[PDB]
Design a protein around this ligand. Sequence first.
Ligand SMILES: Cc1cn([C@H]2C=C[C@@H](COP(=O)(O)OP(=O)(O)OP(=O)(O)O)O2)c(=O)[nH]c1=O
Ligand SMILES: [Mg+2]
Ligand SMILES: [Mg+2]
Lengths: 555, 412
Amino acid sequence: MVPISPIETVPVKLKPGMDGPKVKQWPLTEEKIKALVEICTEMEKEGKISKIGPENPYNTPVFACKKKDSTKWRKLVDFRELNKRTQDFWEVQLGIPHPAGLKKKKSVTVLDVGDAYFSVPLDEDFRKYTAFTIPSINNETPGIRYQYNVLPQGWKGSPAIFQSSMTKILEPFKKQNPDIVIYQYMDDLYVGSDLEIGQHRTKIEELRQHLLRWGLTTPDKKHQKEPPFLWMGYELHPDKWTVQPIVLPEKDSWTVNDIQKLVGKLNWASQIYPGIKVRQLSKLLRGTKALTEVIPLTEEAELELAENREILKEPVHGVYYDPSKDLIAEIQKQGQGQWTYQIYQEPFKNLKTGKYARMRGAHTNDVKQLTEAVQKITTESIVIWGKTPKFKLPIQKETWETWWTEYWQATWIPEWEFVNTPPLVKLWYQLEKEPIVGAETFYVDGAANRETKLGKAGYVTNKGRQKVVPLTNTTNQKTELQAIYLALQDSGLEVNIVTDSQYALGIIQAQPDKSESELVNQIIEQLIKKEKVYLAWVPAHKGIGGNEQVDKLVS
Amino acid sequence: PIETVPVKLKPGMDGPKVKQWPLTEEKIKALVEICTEMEKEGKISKIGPENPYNTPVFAIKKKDSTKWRKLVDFRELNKRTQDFWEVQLGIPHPAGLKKKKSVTVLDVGDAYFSVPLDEDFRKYTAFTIPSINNETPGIRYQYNVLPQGWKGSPAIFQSSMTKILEPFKKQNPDIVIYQYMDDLYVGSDLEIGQHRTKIEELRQHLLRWPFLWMGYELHPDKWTVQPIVLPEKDSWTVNDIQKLVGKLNWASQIYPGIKVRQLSKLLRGTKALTEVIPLTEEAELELAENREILKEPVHGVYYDPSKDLIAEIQKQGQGQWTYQIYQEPFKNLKTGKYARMRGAHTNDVKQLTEAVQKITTESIVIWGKTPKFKLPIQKETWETWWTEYWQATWIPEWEFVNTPPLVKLWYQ
DNA sequence: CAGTCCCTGTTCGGGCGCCG
DNA sequence: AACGGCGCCCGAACAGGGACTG
Ligand SMILES: Cc1cn([C@H]2C=C[C@@H](COP(=O)(O)OP(=O)(O)OP(=O)(O)O)O2)c(=O)[nH]c1=O
Ligand SMILES: [Mg+2]
Ligand SMILES: [Mg+2]
C-alpha cells in the first residue's frame, strides 16, 4: 500500500512480443555495497521504492558513481536491455538554451529540483517491469529484491517523462504570472522578472510552494539569489554573461584522444571567443584509427594551437538580447575554407560568436562557402532569437550579383550590406558568354584504357597547333581535365576551348577557386592568368568540327 | 453524433517520426494562439512523450492575406495511408476542369473540424510546437477531428461534401466542382461577372451549414506551353552550329526523326568558333525539316493514372524559369515557362517557391495529382527559406538536383 | 541493351565538447 | 559500465549518372 503522488502518471508500454529484462548482476566492490543499501531503505520508507518477492521473474544490474562536486552519491540503473524492449519516446527537448537569447531582467533566480527523477511516479502497470536485487554482502545474504515506483536514472524514458511532467505543473503558475519568464531545462529552473528584488522573492516563494504541492523540493543548497549565477555552464551577470573557465590540457606528447578533447573544447569556446580555428588540429585526426597513438604536432597545427591559447588569455564576455534593437551578423574569412562571425546589436558588444569551416564538395569557391556560412548563421539565429539578423558580408554587391544571376542553381542571401574588411570575397575568373573573336580555338579531348590505366590527352587548333601527351595510371575524366590543362598552358591570354566532357565542363563552369584535386587547382591557376576564356561543349562521337579530329589522336 | 470512419496505415509501415524544425518568433506566436483556440474548441488535445509519432508544423499567409494559417507537413503521414485516399474512398477527377474559362479555389478545410477522428488514429496526427531559445520543452498536441492537410480528411468528408454540394450542382449542371485536400475547385465558362456571382452563391450555400471569404482565380484555358524552338539567325558561325547540333542531338531523345547529317557537314575541319558558315542548300532543308518535327506532337505520350508525376525546373536567368512534367523520361505531358514572378531579379528562392506552387496547382487541375519536384537548389538553401514564401495549404514531394546547363534546351 | 568504372553526392554512427 | 538533448569533424556504406565495353 503506497500513496499515489499528485503528479499524473504517464502510461508506458513495451514493444509487442517482448518481455522484461532478465540480466544477472555485476560483481562490484564493497564500497558500492555500503552506498546503496542505505538508499534502497530510505526510498522504501519514503514510498519511492517497494519490495517484491518471487512473483517478479525479472532482474537488472545497477551501479553508482560520485556526484560531480558533491558528497552525495548518484545511483544509475543499467537499463540497456530494458531500453531495447521499451517503447520509443518522442523527446520534447528540442535543443539547448543559450544565454545570448536571454533578455535583460532586473531580478534573476536559479532553482534546482532536488531528487528530480525520484519525485515523478512511474506508470502503475509498468512498475512490475523494473525488478532488481540488492545483496547486503557480496557472497552471503541473498538480499531482498525491490522495485521502482518513480523514474529510475538510466532508463531511456526517464528524461522525457520528467520534462513533460514538469511542464504540466508549471502551466498553471505561468498562466497566473504571465510577465515572469521561466526557462525550464531538465530540473534546473531559470526564473527572471522585471519586478523589484523584494517582490521577486515573493513570487519565488510562491513558486517554491506551488511546486511543493506535487512533491517537488527546491532545497537551499542549489538556490541562487545573487549573481554570478551558474546556469547551463555559463556565468550570468546582471548585464553580461561568459562561459565558465575553459582549461586546455598541455601535454608534452600528443595522442589522438587528447586532440579530440582539445578540438571539442575549442568548438565549445568558439561561441564567445572570436577567431578560433580547428582546421590544422582536426587535420591530424585523419587516417589513423588508434585512440592511443602518439601524433606529432605539425608546424601548422602548432601555430594554430599557439594562436588559440593567446585568444583564451584575455577575458571575453557576451551581452543579452534586446528585442528593441536589430540583430547584426558580420562574417570574416580566416582562409583555408575557414570563416568566423560575430552576432551583436551594439557595436563591439557581441551576443555570441562562431565559426563555419565545413568543406563540402570536391570543388568550391569562397562565394559558395560564404553562402553556406550565412545559412548556418540564419538557422542558428532563428533557434536562439527567432529572427534572421541583417548581415555584413566581405563581398561586393556587384560580386554577389554576378554570381547568383549567372549560376544555374537557385541561391540567395537575406538582407545584407557590404563591409570593406579584407580579405574580400571575389570571383577569381569569369568564363565568357560568347566565343572570342581572334582567339585561337582549341579542340581538346582525352581517353584512357580501363584495364592498363594508360591514356592520352591533347588538342588541335584552327591555326594548326597540336599536341598529344601519353599518360600513365589515369582515367578518362583525368585525361579530359588534362586536355583542358594543356590547352590553357599552350594558349595566349585569350582562348576558346571546345570539349565533349560534361564532367570537366561541369567543374569549371561553377568557377571554383579551390579543389581537393591538384590537377583542378592547376587548371584554376591557369584560368586566373588568362584574360578571356570561352568554354564550349559538343556531343562526343558525332563528327562535329575539330572534336572529330582530336578524337582520332587520343584514341 | 457521427461514427468515426476507421482509418488504418498501410501494412508494414509505422507512423511518422519527423523532427520539428525551428520556427520564427511571429510563427510561434501565431501557432500558440491558433492551438489555444483549437484546444478550447476541442479540435486538438495536449499529449505526452508516450506518443512516439510527430509531424512538423508551421504557419503561412495566403496571397493577399494578413491572417496566419496553421499548416502541418503531413507529407509523411499521407504516403503512409495511401491505400485509403486512393483505393477505398477515392475522389474522381473531372477532365473538364482544365477546359473551363475560369476556376476559383476555395479553402474549405475548416469544415473538416466538425467530423471526429478515429480514436485509434489520433496518435498519428501528433505535432510539436517549439519554443524560442528552447525556453520551454515542446508543446505537443494531437488532432481530435479531421486535420487540415491530411489526404484522408477530404475522403471521409466526401460523403458529407456531396450532400452540401448537391443542391448547387442541380441548380447549375454546367459548373464543374473538384475537391483536392483542403481546397475546392469551381470551374465555369461563365463570364467573370457571372462567375464570381455564382461563386458567392456557393459560399452562402456553405455558410448555411475562417478562409471561406477568399477565392484564388485561375484560367486554365489561357495556360500556355513552351515547345522546343530553334534560333533563327541571318548568319551562322561555327559556335552557333555546334550549339545547334548539340541541341538537336539531345532533342533526338524526344523526336526520333531529327537529323543532323547536313548540319554537321558544315563543321568539317578544325575551324575557329567565330568563323561565319553559310548554310548550304541541304542544310537549309534539314533545319527546316527539324523545325516542323518540333511542332508535331510526340508519339505515344499519354497520362497514366497509376504513375507518379515528376516535375523538373530550370533556372534560365533574368526571371525566367522553365519546367517539364512527365511520368516517363522524354515523354513530357506538359512543358512551360514562367517569367516575372514575385522576387524576380532579386530572390531565387521566392521565385522557385512560386514556380513550385504554380506547377502543383496546374497538376491538380489537369490530373488531380501533385508531382514530385526535382529542384535546382542546394538542400540546405531550400530548407532554410522555402517556408518563408510558401502560400499553399498543400506541400508536394521534392528532391534536389545539380545539372549544369551543358546546352540550353528549353530557353535559347 | 546490361554491367562495370569513375566520380561526387548524402546519410549515419562514433569521437569529442557541453547540459541535466 | 547508464539515459536524453544540441553542436563539431571524421570515415565507412550507399546512391546515382556519364561513359565505356561485352
Ligand atoms: C547529471 C545527470 C542528471 N540526470 C538527471 C537526473 C536528475 C536530473 C538532474 O540531476 P541532478 O540535479 O544533478 O541531481 P538531482 O537528481 O536533481 O538531485 P539533486 O542533487 O539536485 O538534489 O537529471 C541524469 O539522469 N544523469 C546525469 O548524469
Ligand atoms: Mg537537481
Ligand atoms: Mg572526349
